[PDB]
């Protein structure tokens, strides 16, 4: 039976030098070397004819020798893509001989990652909804491993492809930013992930940050490889607002998914120009005109009342507009940084105010010099 | 009737769930604890013994006590699956022995190594002359699977004691099947 | 969970007196101790605390020692004389946080889930406010590491209790309540 | 305050065991920030009655301790007792 | 052949059930020892609302007092006519109660 | 031949639990009932009147001195 494994899996020379180590290693009865070297045997990217032929034999020994369960089996079920190439029998195999089989802190949730991720090409967000939700129902405070957050980000993104809540792409991008442990993010492989990044957090409208994620560089490292004028109008998805070439060109290029966003991305920059003008413009002008609204907002003179009353109903600003002369009135707002690392506003207002109330507090002391007596 | 403060520093690293020891390495180091507690009790019932681990955690786990029942209660649910940390596991032992008030009891520290980790020889020769200042001759009994003939633990024992010292028997593990008694045949009389 | 507290300066003198225990004999120069807490409401309340015999080394800065008879059965004697008082957290000096903080956080959470430690000062000549309170939650990061138990801060405050200043305010004699209009608010102004 | 029978239960016991063996009588009621309401004394032997009980080498503090005009049951029990001075020592780091 | 694992599982069942049930009654009776913190109260009835924080209570053998609540004892609930539980030392109100009097109203 | 010895050592693993849980029963019970003997050696046991019962497990006391007491935890009886 070890002679059977030797005659079966050793399909080439030089390879069996460690398979003889395996057929002595079972007599040594030490299986953390299993957990390392046979995991490396699982790891091997090739055509891999031996591993799928021998996974049934390794299950025949996995019935007895209490294996380290999730690691090799889950990394090998996608090495089965030479042997079986069918999830509709692999789901049977999987759910029948693996739901009782785990060795981790929480590995029933990686079992649910397997279920949800193998019900992509056979299922469409109907029965995977409950169980993929049940994954983070069971996460909540647990991931002291967080290597399962790799497959949790996989269910996250590959299930977010199944439409529903575009505002969870800033959060799913936080998951991409907070999934991998070491630095290894590919460039020419994650430029396709830049193509889903930019053109799946851009078109949809649950997002409203408009340059906040553009601060983070792991996306622009993947976007400089993509076509620059799409990335130029991505750079115009910042405080440059009218720019009748830029968003026009991304309405030239990006062909699908420009039907529900028809004028609603214009509505997003139409509500966003108000916060960009009450924060960008160097205030003490808060009750103001309307032509800069009808110029930067790419709206007309007439349609600013819909603009201001809908933008008040949204909830990013709460000032009741002086409507008789189309005069703006504003409140609390959300910032997008000041002078390039906040030099000027910080200095000339914050420290100016510091020495203002500090030195006039010294003046309070100066006239209140001996009123303490 | 020697008065000592034996603080074994157990190993619950991720290499210690296999069966080169009898079924189970828990039972192997457990029997090592059994023989040291029974044997030091037969030399002196008025000692005090505590266990502690170093694989990713070092605790205040056991009070240094003669009662071997508490230690044998704490040899269950140990779960050897951690990442073995060699650096803090001896400083924690000697600061446990500096949290003593009976110091007419002398000092004995033993440690079980069944895992390789690399280290500078400076980072052990300073700790070995530190142990020479710290008045403990450490008797490391190596278990598990291991880098065969580690020089780091060898130089650690060599610069750990000289000039007719206690005679720290660095018993490196025999690689392969053996028992939890043939490896403590030699250090139980002189560690 | 923990939002604001009610803390009475009996814990403060219970810090300063162990500071008198380890100050003149100063070798590890730190007062680290356990904060008993009469957990009544969402607002917390303390009327008792004790200081553990404790050390904390610098190298790998995770070697540290409780005294679990002094931790368990002293708390049991305390529970017998006062069952209303139970554990709520702990305290230490050295207001610069460090790496062993998260380890004693790991152990303080298993005694009480919403535990809170107290950074103190032994000489507040402050603005001022008294000693600190945290809250330990898991937010992990935008990073993707295994669980980050980073110390979040509870806004600390002070309450009061009947008959606990009887001799002390008698000794100070410099008590001046009703003078707001010349000094008591200009101090706040300056401040 | 008063001089209890608990005094004559345990005071002979703790003057057998210990030497100074100071009895302590307490009350919290009389103020909240400005009084010294606790009270403390010590049992006198019967054997010193041959000596007249008026030596005291520093009579400022007996001129401060007799001075509050001792209240009811203390001098109801001047016998079996002799008083003791209780100041509050230098505790300024806590006081400030 | 391995019924000593069931002589160990039966030792677990019997010895652990018996010691855990003895220590469970000892847990609830250590809580009865913890009731040597919950040491007594008094009971009186609110006779009037003196001020918004004060009440005149009725010691059932005798005299009448001035009390307050604990902190949050619903000062609108404590109308003149309710019965309260009174503190032992501080003597103030601790807990409301029902009841009322002679069963010649009740027995009819 | 290996699992039976594992159950043999687990019998002592449960016997240590037997020792400690019988300690938490017996040595704590000596505390409890020594305190209760300390409550069982008194001047009377004052006769009284229990009139109602509460739940937010309680018992009220109205003595023959016409004193209405209360205790929230009842102690060595049941409801």
Curated annotation (Swiss-Prot), chain A:
Q: Which residues carry this modification: N6-acetyllysine?
A: 295
Q: Which UniProt keywords apply?
A: Acetylation, Proteasome
Q: Where is the PCI domain?
A: 168-335
Q: Do the record's keywords include Acetylation?
A: yes
Q: Name one GO biological process term.
A: meiosis I
* Listed SUPFAM superfamilies: Winged helix' DNA-binding domain
Q: Main role?
A: Component of the 26S proteasome, a multiprotein complex involved in the ATP-dependent degradation of ubiquitinated proteins. This complex plays a key role in the maintenance of protein homeostasis by removing misfolded or damaged proteins, which could impair cellular functions, and by removing proteins whose functions are no longer required. Therefore, the proteasome participates in numerous cellular processes, including cell cycle progression, apoptosis, or DNA damage repair.
Record's subunit section: Component of the 19S proteasome regulatory particle complex. The 26S proteasome consists of a 20S core particle (CP) and two 19S regulatory subunits (RP). The regulatory particle is made of a lid composed of 9 subunits including PSMD13, a base containing 6 ATPases and few additional components.
The record's similarity note reads:
Belongs to the proteasome subunit S11 family.
Q: What protein is this chain from?
A: 26S proteasome non-ATPase regulatory subunit 13
Q: Gene encoding this polypeptide?
A: PSMD13
From Swiss-Prot, chain D:
User: Where is Zn(2+) annotated to bind?
Assistant: 7
Residue numbers carrying Phosphoserine: 31
Which residue spans adopt a coiled-coil conformation according to this UniProt entry? none
Reported tissue expression = Widely expressed. Highest levels in heart and skeletal muscle.
Report quaternary structure and partners.
Component of the 19S proteasome regulatory particle complex. The 26S proteasome consists of a 20S core particle (CP) and two 19S regulatory subunits (RP). The regulatory particle is made of a lid composed of 9 subunits including PSMD4, a base containing 6 ATPases and few additional components. Within the complex, PSMD4 interacts with subunit PSMD7 through their respective MPN domain. Interacts with TXNL1.
Family to which this protein belongs:
Belongs to the peptidase M67A family. PSMD14 subfamily.
Q: What does this protein do?
A: Component of the 26S proteasome, a multiprotein complex involved in the ATP-dependent degradation of ubiquitinated proteins. This complex plays a key role in the maintenance of protein homeostasis by removing misfolded or damaged proteins, which could impair cellular functions, and by removing proteins whose functions are no longer required. Therefore, the proteasome participates in numerous cellular processes, including cell cycle progression, apoptosis, or DNA damage repair.
Q: What is this protein called?
A: 26S proteasome non-ATPase regulatory subunit 14
Instruction: Report which gene this protein is encoded by.
Output: PSMD14
The stretch of the full-length protein covered here is: 120 to 215 of 310
Swiss-Prot record, chain E:
A single Gene Ontology molecular function, please? proteasome-activating activity
Q: List where in the cell it is found.
A: Cytoplasm; Nucleus
Its main localization is: cytoplasm
Q: Which residues carry this modification: N6-acetyllysine?
A: 58
Q: Which domain of life is it from?
A: Eukaryota
Key words of the record: Acetylation, ATP-binding, Cytoplasm, Nucleotide-binding, Nucleus, Phosphoprotein, Proteasome
GO cellular component terms given for this protein: cytosol; cytosolic proteasome complex; extracellular exosome; inclusion body; membrane; nucleoplasm; nucleus; proteasome accessory complex
Q: Would you kindly state one Gene Ontology biological process term found in this protein's UniProt entry? A: positive regulation of proteasomal protein catabolic process
Q: RNA-binding: present as a keyword of the record?
A: no
The protein's role, per its UniProt record? Component of the 26S proteasome, a multiprotein complex involved in the ATP-dependent degradation of ubiquitinated proteins. This complex plays a key role in the maintenance of protein homeostasis by removing misfolded or damaged proteins, which could impair cellular functions, and by removing proteins whose functions are no longer required. Therefore, the proteasome participates in numerous cellular processes, including cell cycle progression, apoptosis, or DNA damage repair.
Q: How does it assemble?
A: Component of the 19S proteasome regulatory particle complex. The 26S proteasome consists of a 20S core particle (CP) and two 19S regulatory subunits (RP). The regulatory particle is made of a lid composed of 9 subunits, a base containing 6 ATPases including PSMC6 and few additional components. Interacts with PAAF1.
| Protein family | Belongs to the AAA ATPase family.
Q: What name does UniProt use for this protein? A: 26S proteasome regulatory subunit 10B
Q: Which organism is it from?
A: Homo sapiens
Curated annotation (Swiss-Prot), chain F:
Where is this protein localized, as stated in its record?
Answer: Cytoplasm; Nucleus
Q: Which cysteine pairs make disulfide bonds? A: none
Q: How is it modified after translation?
A: Sumoylated by UBE2I in response to MEKK1-mediated stimuli.
Q: Which residues cross the membrane?
A: none
Per its UniProt record, which disorder involves this protein? Deafness, cataract, impaired intellectual development, and polyneuropathy: An autosomal recessive disease characterized by early onset of deafness, cataract, severe developmental delay, and severely impaired intellectual development. Patients later develop polyneuropathy of the lower extremities, associated with depigmentation of the hair in that area.
Which family does this protein fall into?
Belongs to the AAA ATPase family.
Quaternary structure (record): Component of the 19S proteasome regulatory particle complex. The 26S proteasome consists of a 20S core particle (CP) and two 19S regulatory subunits (RP). The regulatory particle is made of a lid composed of 9 subunits, a base containing 6 ATPases including PSMC3 and few additional components. Interacts with PAAF1.
Output this protein's name: 26S proteasome regulatory subunit 6A
Could you tell me which species this protein originates from? Homo sapiens
Per the record, the gene is PSMC3
Report which part of the complete sequence is shown: 44 to 142 of 439
């Amino acid at each position: 039976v070890p002679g059977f494994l030797q005659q079966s899996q050793n399909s080439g020379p030089g390879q069996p030098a460690v398979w003889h180590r395996l057929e002595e290693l079972y007599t040594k009865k030490l299986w953390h070397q299993l957990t390392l070297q046979v995991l490396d045997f699982v790891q091997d990217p090739c055509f891999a004819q031996g591993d799928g032929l021998i996974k049934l034999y390794e299950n025949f020994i996995s019935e007895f020798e209490h294996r380290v369960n999730p690691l090799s089996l889950v990394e090998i079920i996608l090495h089965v893509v030479r042997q079986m190439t069918d999830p509709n029998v692999a789901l049977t195999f999987l759910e029948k001989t693996r739901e009782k089989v785990k060795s981790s802190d929480e590995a029933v949730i990686l079992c649910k990652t397997a279920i949800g991720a193998l019900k992509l090409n056979i299922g469409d967000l109907q029965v995977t909804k409950e169980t993929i939700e049940d994954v983070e129902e069971m996460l909540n405070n647990l991931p002291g491993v967080t290597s399962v957050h790799s497959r949790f980000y996989d269910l996250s993104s590959k299930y977010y492809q199944t439409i529903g809540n575009h505002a969870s792409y800033y959060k799913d991008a936080l998951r991409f930013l907070g999934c991998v442990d070491i630095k290894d993010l590919p460039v020419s492989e994650q430029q396709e992930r830049a193509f889903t990044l930019g053109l799946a957090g851009l078109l949809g409208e649950g997002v409203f940050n408009f340059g906040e994620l553009l601060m983070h560089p792991v996306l622009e490292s993947l976007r400089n490889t993509d076509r620059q004028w799409l990335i130029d109008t991505l750079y115009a998805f910042n405080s440059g607002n009218v720019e009748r070439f830029q968003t026009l060109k991304t309405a030239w290029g990006q062909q699908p998914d420009l039907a529900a966003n028809e004028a609603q991305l214009l509505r997003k920059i139409q509500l966003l120009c108000l916060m960009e003008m009450t924060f960008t413009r160097p205030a003490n002008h808060r009750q103001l005109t309307f032509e800069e609204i009808a110029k930067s907002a790419k709206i007309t003179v007439n349609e600013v009342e819909l603009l201001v009353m809908k933008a008040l109903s949204v909830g990013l600003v709460k000032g009741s507009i002086d409507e008789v002369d189309k005069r703006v009135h504003m409140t609390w707002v959300q910032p997008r940084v000041l002078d390039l690392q906040q030099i000027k506003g910080m200095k000339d207002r914050l420290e100016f105010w510091c020495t203002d109330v500090k030195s006039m507090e010294m003046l309070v002391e100066h006239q209140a010099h001996d009123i303490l007596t | 009737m020697v008065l000592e403060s034996t603080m074994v520093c157990v190993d619950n690293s991720e290499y210690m769930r296999n069966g080169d020891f009898l079924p189970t390495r828990l039972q192997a180091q457990q029997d090592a604890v059994n023989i040291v507690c029974h044997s030091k009790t037969r030399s002196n019932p008025e000692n005090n013994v505590g266990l502690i681990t170093l694989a990713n955690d070092c605790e205040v786990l056991t009070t240094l006590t003669p009662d071997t029942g508490r230690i044998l209660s704490k040899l269950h649910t140990v779960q050897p699956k951690g990442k073995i940390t060699f650096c803090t596991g001896i400083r924690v032992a000697h600061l446990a022995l500096k949290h003593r008030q009976g110091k007419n009891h002398k000092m004995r520290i033993i440690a079980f190594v069944g895992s390789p980790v690399e280290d500078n020889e400076k980072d052990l020769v300073k700790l070995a002359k530190r142990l020479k200042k710290e008045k403990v001759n450490v008797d490391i009994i190596n278990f598990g699977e291991e880098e065969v003939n580690t020089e780091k633990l060898t130089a650690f024992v060599n610069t750990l004691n000289g000039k007719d010292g206690t005679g720290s028997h660095l018993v490196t593990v025999p690689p392969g099947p053996s028992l939890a008694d043939a490896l403590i045949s030699s250090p139980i009389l002189a560690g | 969970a923990v939002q604001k507290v009610v803390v009475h300066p009996l814990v403060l003198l219970s810090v300063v007196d162990h500071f008198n225990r380890i100050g003149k004999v100063g070798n590890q120069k730190r007062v680290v101790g356990v904060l008993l807490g009469s957990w009544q409401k969402k607002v917390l309340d303390v009327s008792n605390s004790f200081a553990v015999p404790f050390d904390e080394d610098d190298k790998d800065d995770s070697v540290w020692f409780l005294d679990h008879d002094y931790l368990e059965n002293m708390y049991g004697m305390f529970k017998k004389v006062n069952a209303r008082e139970r554990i709520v957290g702990w305290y230490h000096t050295g207001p610069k946080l460090h790496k062993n903080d998260i380890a004693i956080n790991e152990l303080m959470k298993r005694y009480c889930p919403n535990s809170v430690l107290v950074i103190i000062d032994v000489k507040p000549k402050d603005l001022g406010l008294p000693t600190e309170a945290y809250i330990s939650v898991e937010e992990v990061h935008d990073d993707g590491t295994p669980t980050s138990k980073t110390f979040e801060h509870v806004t600390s405050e002070i309450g009061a209790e009947e008959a606990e200043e009887v001799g002390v305010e008698h000794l100070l004699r410099d008590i001046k309540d009703t003078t707001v209009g010349t000094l008591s608010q200009r101090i706040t102004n300056q401040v | 305050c008063w001089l209890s029978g608990v005094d004559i239960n345990t005071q002979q016991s703790f003057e057998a065991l210990s030497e100074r063996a100071v009895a302590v009588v307490v009350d919290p009621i009389q103020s909240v920030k400005g009084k010294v309401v606790i009270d403390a004394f010590r049992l006198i032997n019967a054997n010193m009655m041959v000596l007249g009980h008026e030596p005291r080498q520093t009579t400022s503090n007996l001129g401060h301790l007799n001075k509050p005009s001792i209240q009811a049951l203390i001098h109801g029990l001047n016998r079996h007792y002799y008083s003791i001075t209780i100041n509050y020592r230098k505790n300024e780091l806590e006081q400030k | 052949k391995l019924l000593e694992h069931k002589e160990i599982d039966g030792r677990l069942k019997e010895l652990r059930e018996q010691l855990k049930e003895l220590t469970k009654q000892y847990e609830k009776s250590e809580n009865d020892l913890k009731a040597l913190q919950s040491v007594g109260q008094i009971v009186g009835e609110v006779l009037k609302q003196l001020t918004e924080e004060k009440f005149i209570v009725k010691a059932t053998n005798g005299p009448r007092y001035v009390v307050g609540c604990r902190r949050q004892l619903d000062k609108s609930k404590l109308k003149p006519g309710t019965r309260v539980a009174l503190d032992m030392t501080t003597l103030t109100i601790m807990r409301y109660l029902p009841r009322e009097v002679d069963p010649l109203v009740y027995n009819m | 031949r290996t699992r039976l010895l594992d159950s043999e050592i687990k019998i002592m693993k449960s016997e240590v639990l037997r020792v400690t849980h019988e300690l938490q029963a017996m040595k704590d019970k000596i505390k409890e009932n020594s305190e209760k003997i300390k409550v069982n050696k008194t001047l009377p046991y004052l006769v009284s009147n229990v009139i109602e019962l509460l739940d937010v497990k309680c018992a009220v006391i109205k003595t023959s001195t016409r004193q209405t007491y209360f205790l929230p935890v009842i102690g060595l009886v049941d409801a």
